[PDB]
Structure 1
């Protein structure tokens, strides 16, 4: 097919509990399934038995492992782990045709980090060194890949929800999207931080000051399931989504992610729930564009003749997190060489015969440089 064909369809996800790619570490080779996380910057692998791991990295069998004689601990919003730093050879067999010596944290203990049944045994933090632990001197995997090889400084993700998808490393594959790509600047290289300049629920502007949508940051994060919104924005958005979906009433806990609602298999009334649009700053002064997701992205299946769903927009106290809810609508291009992130409608996103996810523009939006937090 296109020149990156052998990286298409290189991601899997088991019951929707994270998308992961196979990575092969050490010598002789040990291949493990690695969750792709654009919200963090450590490459870390299970390296000791755990009840939720089928396999783990055995350093003593790899002749090329080098111990860096330093511990590392990483806490996330969900979960934490502790382990030991070293370096070893790493290749991605359905990724670029190169092998690099990368830092690797060997996870030896953890709390609420591994997910039973998820089939992944480590994490690949693809964001930048500023947020790596123990500190920014520990080079992240993608930085090593670009410094040691010819691979261009860009990767792109198509996360296909319900689970699989593609991680194209070093380019873009045009089969994975339709329409045009539209780009927003990476505001700052730490997380993949972006600026959200307007939010609409079924065409209706939420009308908050744009500084509320980015307080205290907005990031794109493939290792977080939900669209997470700061408190005032979440409360406002729920009020508006309730109002829009008012031909059916749901208990208050459903909008808090505490109750599920189930429909008989195949009857979910998608049409009653609104589309949600986020407008992002564009590449030209005063220009923006909008990405629009469907309830097939923000109502997530929980795995009888019953389709059960959880509402997967939730409250955050650390800014807007555009997680898998947002990314499953779109092919997302992390164009680190041009400090920008591109969105296009994904060729695999879940939709129905009446509505599809969309990426549209340009719009005119003034004073966008004021939306960001300082």
Structure 2
């Protein structure tokens, strides 16, 4: 899988992208690797934040589906026109696929200035594809049309006038053993829509938050490479910040820091890492009543940002933030670990990443099993709206 190592790039906090080609002749574009969505969509007209964009008219293999599409998120939205074309990943498997492509004609707060990506590769399942689940996602087409095994794995590696460059690997169709150390532990995919998982316990420096475990998964928990932060439901976020504040309390930061709105700095090389606690998320195991924990360091949840003003200092942003749409294990979580999206066996694997940032006292960890007697169900059941209920699924 050596051709696929180091096939991701980006700027810290602005997303990890893979180079792709679309059309004949091939048009090169940088595409955000997003496990939190299910569309393949590309800028297809001019925009202040785009260096370039997909030109449908210039591809001999383009076919128009004569259907539009709209995709809104909490943060960002876009629209455009559906088609199919030939798609390749130059630093990926040596194959070409005909895939659905949404050509983005208008957007708001979607593209990011300086991020260097021009589209989004949604790697999650058909159930959350827009406009509906009959629009086959890219990965589904790749698997149906070629020999590629139904699995991919991600190694996201964390980091004065520009943000820090980041790198990573998307291994399509298998697992590369150079990218991790130790044991690979799996948590079941609860339902194939998002990459939904179940968190059963949360500890901050070995201390249990002691919430009803449904709170951890209210209203869902997902793994999303296209989200920067670890995002936590309001109640959990408040409890967690209260605990990190207590552990770190020899230092008094502004409110803005804990809201993710302000940097805090120390003299170059003097950051007191050991005043900030590790955070452990216990995930449901493949075996009933078992779990395993993934443990991240402050080196994951404190994001480095060079201050043009005091570029003499090491400065950081707090990258845990509040959610009202459940837990999101974003790049903060993922940068600890080699993460295996084992779609074939409806599971997600975690192992300690060979590239994760740590120090000489602590490492990110993946440890199990931990066993419980008579587990409560920690899953939440989203209220069924009449809209969603009325959908037929043929």
TM-score grouping bracket, smaller chain normalisation: over 0.9
> How do 1:1-374 residues align onto structure 2 when only pairs under 5 Å count?
4-161=1-158, 163-303=166-306, 304-368=311-375, 370-374=377-381
1:248 Cα deviation after fit: 1.4
Q: Secondary structure, in 3 states, of the residue corresponding to 1:291?
A: strand
8 Å CA contact 1:197, 1:365 repeated in 2: no
> Deviations 1:163-197 (Å, cap 9, x if unpaired)?
00100000000000010100000000000000000
8 Å CA contact 1:160, 1:349 repeated in 2: yes
8 Å CA contact 1:16, 1:163 repeated in 2: no
> Deviations 1:41-75 (Å, cap 9, x if unpaired)?
00000111111111111111100000000111111
Distance in 2, Cα, partners of 1:337 & 1:368 = 27
- Which runs of no fewer than 5 residues in structure 1 stay unpaired? none
Change (3 A) 1:146 1:116: same
1:17 Cα deviation after fit: 1.1
Return 333-342 or 8-17, whichever deviates more.
Answer: 8-17
**TM-score under structure 2 length normalisation:** 0.93
Q: Secondary structure, in 3 states, of the residue corresponding to 2:11?
A: coil
1:367 Cα deviation after fit: 4.3
> Deviations 1:180-227 (Å, cap 9, x if unpaired)?
100000000000000000000000011101010001100000000000
Return 361-370 or 14-23, whichever deviates more.
Answer: 361-370
Distance in 2, Cα, partners of 1:39 & 1:24 = 22
Distance in 1, Cα, partners of 2:298 & 2:374 = 31
Q: How many matched pairs?
A: 371
Q: Secondary structure, in 3 states, of the residue corresponding to 1:113?
A: coil
1:249 Cα deviation after fit: 1.8
In structure 1, what is the equivalent of residue 389 of structure 2?
A: none
Distance in 1, Cα, partners of 2:146 & 2:182 = 32
Distance in 2, Cα, partners of 1:365 & 1:298 = 28
Return 75-84 or 249-258, whichever deviates more.
Answer: 249-258
Q: Secondary structure, in 3 states, of the residue corresponding to 1:124?
A: strand
Distance in 1, Cα, partners of 2:12 & 2:241 = 26
8 Å CA contact 1:226, 1:322 repeated in 2: yes
1:251 Cα deviation after fit: 2.0
> Deviations 1:76-134 (Å, cap 9, x if unpaired)?
22110111100000010111111100000001111011111111010000000110110
- Which runs of no fewer than 5 residues in structure 2 stay unpaired? 159-164, 382-394
Distance in 1, Cα, partners of 2:113 & 2:334 = 23
1:253 Cα deviation after fit: 2.4
Q: Secondary structure, in 3 states, of the residue corresponding to 1:101?
A: strand
Q: Secondary structure, in 3 states, of the residue corresponding to 1:238?
A: helix
Q: Secondary structure, in 3 states, of the residue corresponding to 1:239?
A: helix
Distance in 2, Cα, partners of 1:122 & 1:366 = 46
Q: Secondary structure, in 3 states, of the residue corresponding to 1:369?
A: coil
Distance in 2, Cα, partners of 1:62 & 1:41 = 24
Q: Secondary structure, in 3 states, of the residue corresponding to 1:237?
A: helix
> Deviations 1:141-172 (Å, cap 9, x if unpaired)?
00001111110000000000170010000000
Return 105-114 or 253-262, whichever deviates more.
Answer: 253-262
Instruction: Find runs of 4+ consecutive structure 1 residues off by over 2 angstroms.
Output: 365-369
**TM-score under structure 1 length normalisation:** 0.97
> Deviations 1:299-350 (Å, cap 9, x if unpaired)?
1122321222111111100000000010000000000000000000000001
> Deviations 1:207-256 (Å, cap 9, x if unpaired)?
10101000110000000000011111001111111111122121222111
Change (3 A) 1:340 1:54: same
Distance in 2, Cα, partners of 1:37 & 1:12 = 13
